[PDB]
Amino acid sequence: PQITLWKRPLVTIKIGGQLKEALLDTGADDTVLEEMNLPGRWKPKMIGGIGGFIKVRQYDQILIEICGHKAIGTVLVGPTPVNVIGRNLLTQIGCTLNF
Amino acid sequence: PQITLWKRPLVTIKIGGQLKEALLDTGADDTVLEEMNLPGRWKPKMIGGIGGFIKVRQYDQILIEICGHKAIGTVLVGPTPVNVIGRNLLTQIGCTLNF
Ligand SMILES: CC(C)CN(C[C@@H](O)[C@H](Cc1ccccc1)NC(=O)O[C@H]1CO[C@H]2OCC[C@H]21)S(=O)(=O)c1ccc(CO)cc1
């Protein structure tokens, strides 16, 4: 599809057997999802943006379906106000910016 | 152009007659630039990011050229970690997401 940017580019994702809403975010290097109790090992990470840093849990090789497009990669879990799909997964679904 | 996302979508912008580098950021509603001098009236505002809220100077109706494409709109200036071009200006240059 083609998504215009008049409104936030929110899409439905499937991760860990749950459906959620997330931003297709070209400004995020990596994917960050709202707190959720995922099984498996993780490592702590600090990620920074406007307002400072938050502590997150880095899970590797997580399967995520984004608008019916499957991807697998790093997913950071923490107290983010928004689910954001970052470039590490956007590249996997064939997403480009165009103007 | 069509921009892939294996690297950060960084582009050169012109604002206040000066060249800078900025990130095309579909996850940003607004455009936020690092501390700089800009002419004209500004009003204090607050904006929230992943890590909390920051004080910014809001400049309205500012000319800004993004990768050769002209826009006129609101630019927020403050202690952002990165110059981000947000949806208020991405829409003006006709930017869409595609996959
Ligand atoms: C700043 C940028 C370089 C990096 N960020 C992505 C941005 O898209 C961020 C997304 C966002 C955060 C919080 C609420 C809504 C959207 N948008 C944002 O701050 O937008 C500001 C300006 O416009 C307003 O609209 C929405 C908020 C206001 S990040 O989240 O900090 C981040 C940092 C490290 C990683 C791991 O690599 C992943 C993500």
Side-chain angles (χ1 to χ4, degrees), chain A residues 15-18 20 33-39 57 59 75 77-78 83:
Chain A
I15 179 180
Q18 283 181 318
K20 307 187 168 246
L33 299 178
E34 299 184 31
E35 180 53 54
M36 64 182 308
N37 206 351
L38 278 186
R57 308 195 299 285
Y59 298 84
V75 168
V77 178
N83 296 314

PDB file of all heavy atoms in Angstrom, chain A residues 15-18 20 33-39 57 59 75 77-78 83:
ATOM      1  N   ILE A  15       2.393  -9.620  17.318  1.00  0.00           N
ATOM      2  CA  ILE A  15       3.636  -9.976  17.994  1.00  0.00           C
ATOM      3  C   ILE A  15       3.303 -10.716  19.282  1.00  0.00           C
ATOM      4  O   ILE A  15       2.481 -10.255  20.080  1.00  0.00           O
ATOM      5  CB  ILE A  15       4.508  -8.750  18.330  1.00  0.00           C
ATOM      6  CG1 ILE A  15       5.762  -9.233  19.061  1.00  0.00           C
ATOM      7  CG2 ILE A  15       3.727  -7.767  19.178  1.00  0.00           C
ATOM      8  CD1 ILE A  15       6.713  -8.145  19.466  1.00  0.00           C
ATOM      9  N   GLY A  16       3.996 -11.825  19.521  1.00  0.00           N
ATOM     10  CA  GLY A  16       3.788 -12.581  20.747  1.00  0.00           C
ATOM     11  C   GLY A  16       2.360 -13.038  20.924  1.00  0.00           C
ATOM     12  O   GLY A  16       1.859 -13.085  22.057  1.00  0.00           O
ATOM     13  N   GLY A  17       1.685 -13.362  19.823  1.00  0.00           N
ATOM     14  CA  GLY A  17       0.296 -13.757  19.881  1.00  0.00           C
ATOM     15  C   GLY A  17      -0.670 -12.653  20.237  1.00  0.00           C
ATOM     16  O   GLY A  17      -1.812 -12.936  20.603  1.00  0.00           O
ATOM     17  N   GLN A  18      -0.252 -11.393  20.138  1.00  0.00           N
ATOM     18  CA  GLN A  18      -1.151 -10.280  20.403  1.00  0.00           C
ATOM     19  C   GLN A  18      -1.160  -9.320  19.224  1.00  0.00           C
ATOM     20  O   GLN A  18      -0.148  -9.130  18.545  1.00  0.00           O
ATOM     21  CB  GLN A  18      -0.763  -9.517  21.672  1.00  0.00           C
ATOM     22  CG  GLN A  18      -1.144 -10.201  22.962  1.00  0.00           C
ATOM     23  CD  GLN A  18      -0.756  -9.374  24.168  1.00  0.00           C
ATOM     24  OE1 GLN A  18       0.333  -8.804  24.215  1.00  0.00           O
ATOM     25  NE2 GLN A  18      -1.651  -9.288  25.146  1.00  0.00           N
ATOM     26  N   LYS A  20      -1.629  -5.375  18.049  1.00  0.00           N
ATOM     27  CA  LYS A  20      -1.373  -4.054  18.599  1.00  0.00           C
ATOM     28  C   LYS A  20      -1.344  -3.038  17.468  1.00  0.00           C
ATOM     29  O   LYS A  20      -1.264  -3.398  16.292  1.00  0.00           O
ATOM     30  CB  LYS A  20      -0.048  -4.026  19.366  1.00  0.00           C
ATOM     31  CG  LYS A  20       0.065  -5.113  20.411  1.00  0.00           C
ATOM     32  CD  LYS A  20       1.320  -4.937  21.243  1.00  0.00           C
ATOM     33  CE  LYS A  20       1.289  -5.841  22.459  1.00  0.00           C
ATOM     34  NZ  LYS A  20       1.208  -5.062  23.726  1.00  0.00           N
ATOM     35  N   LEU A  33       8.425  -1.429  21.600  1.00  0.00           N
ATOM     36  CA  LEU A  33       7.030  -1.739  21.864  1.00  0.00           C
ATOM     37  C   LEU A  33       6.699  -1.520  23.334  1.00  0.00           C
ATOM     38  O   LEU A  33       7.547  -1.706  24.215  1.00  0.00           O
ATOM     39  CB  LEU A  33       6.701  -3.176  21.479  1.00  0.00           C
ATOM     40  CG  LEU A  33       6.881  -3.562  20.017  1.00  0.00           C
ATOM     41  CD1 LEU A  33       6.551  -5.048  19.871  1.00  0.00           C
ATOM     42  CD2 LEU A  33       6.022  -2.759  19.076  1.00  0.00           C
ATOM     43  N   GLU A  34       5.448  -1.116  23.572  1.00  0.00           N
ATOM     44  CA  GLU A  34       4.939  -0.888  24.920  1.00  0.00           C
ATOM     45  C   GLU A  34       5.142  -2.134  25.772  1.00  0.00           C
ATOM     46  O   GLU A  34       5.257  -3.251  25.258  1.00  0.00           O
ATOM     47  CB  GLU A  34       3.449  -0.485  24.853  1.00  0.00           C
ATOM     48  CG  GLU A  34       3.199   0.827  24.050  1.00  0.00           C
ATOM     49  CD  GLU A  34       1.736   1.326  24.028  1.00  0.00           C
ATOM     50  OE1 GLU A  34       0.996   1.099  25.008  1.00  0.00           O
ATOM     51  OE2 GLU A  34       1.332   1.968  23.025  1.00  0.00           O
ATOM     52  N   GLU A  35       5.231  -1.926  27.082  1.00  0.00           N
ATOM     53  CA  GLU A  35       5.499  -3.018  28.008  1.00  0.00           C
ATOM     54  C   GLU A  35       4.624  -4.226  27.693  1.00  0.00           C
ATOM     55  O   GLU A  35       3.415  -4.103  27.489  1.00  0.00           O
ATOM     56  CB  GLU A  35       5.259  -2.534  29.439  1.00  0.00           C
ATOM     57  CG  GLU A  35       5.496  -3.580  30.500  1.00  0.00           C
ATOM     58  CD  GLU A  35       6.855  -4.235  30.384  1.00  0.00           C
ATOM     59  OE1 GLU A  35       7.871  -3.510  30.358  1.00  0.00           O
ATOM     60  OE2 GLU A  35       6.900  -5.481  30.311  1.00  0.00           O
ATOM     61  N   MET A  36       5.255  -5.393  27.614  1.00  0.00           N
ATOM     62  CA  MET A  36       4.539  -6.644  27.405  1.00  0.00           C
ATOM     63  C   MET A  36       5.417  -7.771  27.926  1.00  0.00           C
ATOM     64  O   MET A  36       6.646  -7.680  27.891  1.00  0.00           O
ATOM     65  CB  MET A  36       4.173  -6.855  25.930  1.00  0.00           C
ATOM     66  CG  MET A  36       5.331  -7.005  24.961  1.00  0.00           C
ATOM     67  SD  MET A  36       4.765  -7.182  23.247  1.00  0.00           S
ATOM     68  CE  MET A  36       3.581  -8.531  23.386  1.00  0.00           C
ATOM     69  N   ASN A  37       4.780  -8.829  28.421  1.00  0.00           N
ATOM     70  CA  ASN A  37       5.518  -9.883  29.115  1.00  0.00           C
ATOM     71  C   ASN A  37       5.865 -10.998  28.132  1.00  0.00           C
ATOM     72  O   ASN A  37       5.249 -12.066  28.102  1.00  0.00           O
ATOM     73  CB  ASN A  37       4.717 -10.405  30.302  1.00  0.00           C
ATOM     74  CG  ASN A  37       5.602 -10.983  31.385  1.00  0.00           C
ATOM     75  OD1 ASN A  37       6.804 -11.149  31.186  1.00  0.00           O
ATOM     76  ND2 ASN A  37       5.018 -11.290  32.537  1.00  0.00           N
ATOM     77  N   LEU A  38       6.923 -10.745  27.332  1.00  0.00           N
ATOM     78  CA  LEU A  38       7.409 -11.703  26.347  1.00  0.00           C
ATOM     79  C   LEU A  38       8.291 -12.761  27.007  1.00  0.00           C
ATOM     80  O   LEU A  38       9.145 -12.428  27.834  1.00  0.00           O
ATOM     81  CB  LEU A  38       8.230 -11.002  25.271  1.00  0.00           C
ATOM     82  CG  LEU A  38       7.576 -10.292  24.098  1.00  0.00           C
ATOM     83  CD1 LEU A  38       8.699  -9.832  23.151  1.00  0.00           C
ATOM     84  CD2 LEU A  38       6.589 -11.162  23.379  1.00  0.00           C
ATOM     85  N   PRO A  39       8.150 -14.027  26.620  1.00  0.00           N
ATOM     86  CA  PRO A  39       9.085 -15.049  27.096  1.00  0.00           C
ATOM     87  C   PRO A  39      10.420 -14.963  26.369  1.00  0.00           C
ATOM     88  O   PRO A  39      10.545 -14.383  25.290  1.00  0.00           O
ATOM     89  CB  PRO A  39       8.368 -16.368  26.780  1.00  0.00           C
ATOM     90  CG  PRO A  39       7.557 -16.049  25.551  1.00  0.00           C
ATOM     91  CD  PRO A  39       7.177 -14.576  25.651  1.00  0.00           C
ATOM     92  N   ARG A  57      14.035  -3.575  27.419  1.00  0.00           N
ATOM     93  CA  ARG A  57      14.545  -4.936  27.327  1.00  0.00           C
ATOM     94  C   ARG A  57      14.689  -5.304  25.857  1.00  0.00           C
ATOM     95  O   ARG A  57      13.720  -5.227  25.093  1.00  0.00           O
ATOM     96  CB  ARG A  57      13.615  -5.912  28.045  1.00  0.00           C
ATOM     97  CG  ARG A  57      13.303  -5.498  29.480  1.00  0.00           C
ATOM     98  CD  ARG A  57      12.692  -6.637  30.298  1.00  0.00           C
ATOM     99  NE  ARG A  57      11.419  -7.097  29.741  1.00  0.00           N
ATOM    100  CZ  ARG A  57      10.269  -6.433  29.838  1.00  0.00           C
ATOM    101  NH1 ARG A  57      10.220  -5.265  30.462  1.00  0.00           N
ATOM    102  NH2 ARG A  57       9.166  -6.937  29.301  1.00  0.00           N
ATOM    103  N   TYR A  59      14.970  -7.909  23.052  1.00  0.00           N
ATOM    104  CA  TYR A  59      14.746  -9.285  22.623  1.00  0.00           C
ATOM    105  C   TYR A  59      15.171  -9.421  21.168  1.00  0.00           C
ATOM    106  O   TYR A  59      14.848  -8.564  20.340  1.00  0.00           O
ATOM    107  CB  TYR A  59      13.270  -9.690  22.739  1.00  0.00           C
ATOM    108  CG  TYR A  59      12.705  -9.672  24.132  1.00  0.00           C
ATOM    109  CD1 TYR A  59      12.228  -8.495  24.687  1.00  0.00           C
ATOM    110  CD2 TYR A  59      12.620 -10.834  24.886  1.00  0.00           C
ATOM    111  CE1 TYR A  59      11.706  -8.466  25.960  1.00  0.00           C
ATOM    112  CE2 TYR A  59      12.090 -10.817  26.166  1.00  0.00           C
ATOM    113  CZ  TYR A  59      11.636  -9.625  26.697  1.00  0.00           C
ATOM    114  OH  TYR A  59      11.106  -9.575  27.966  1.00  0.00           O
ATOM    115  N   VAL A  75      13.480  -6.467  18.886  1.00  0.00           N
ATOM    116  CA  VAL A  75      12.323  -5.777  19.441  1.00  0.00           C
ATOM    117  C   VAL A  75      12.705  -5.332  20.846  1.00  0.00           C
ATOM    118  O   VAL A  75      13.121  -6.155  21.668  1.00  0.00           O
ATOM    119  CB  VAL A  75      11.076  -6.677  19.467  1.00  0.00           C
ATOM    120  CG1 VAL A  75       9.974  -6.054  20.300  1.00  0.00           C
ATOM    121  CG2 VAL A  75      10.591  -6.944  18.041  1.00  0.00           C
ATOM    122  N   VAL A  77      11.499  -3.651  24.401  1.00  0.00           N
ATOM    123  CA  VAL A  77      10.264  -3.567  25.176  1.00  0.00           C
ATOM    124  C   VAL A  77      10.505  -2.698  26.400  1.00  0.00           C
ATOM    125  O   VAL A  77      11.462  -2.918  27.152  1.00  0.00           O
ATOM    126  CB  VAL A  77       9.749  -4.959  25.588  1.00  0.00           C
ATOM    127  CG1 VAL A  77       8.490  -4.822  26.425  1.00  0.00           C
ATOM    128  CG2 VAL A  77       9.486  -5.797  24.351  1.00  0.00           C
ATOM    129  N   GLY A  78       9.630  -1.718  26.602  1.00  0.00           N
ATOM    130  CA  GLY A  78       9.779  -0.800  27.699  1.00  0.00           C
ATOM    131  C   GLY A  78       8.652   0.203  27.793  1.00  0.00           C
ATOM    132  O   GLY A  78       7.658   0.142  27.057  1.00  0.00           O
ATOM    133  N   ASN A  83       3.897   2.365  20.381  1.00  0.00           N
ATOM    134  CA  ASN A  83       4.555   1.284  19.658  1.00  0.00           C
ATOM    135  C   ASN A  83       5.142   1.857  18.375  1.00  0.00           C
ATOM    136  O   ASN A  83       4.433   2.507  17.603  1.00  0.00           O
ATOM    137  CB  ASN A  83       3.572   0.158  19.333  1.00  0.00           C
ATOM    138  CG  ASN A  83       3.022  -0.526  20.578  1.00  0.00           C
ATOM    139  OD1 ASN A  83       3.762  -0.855  21.509  1.00  0.00           O
ATOM    140  ND2 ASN A  83       1.714  -0.751  20.588  1.00  0.00           N
TER     141      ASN A  83
END
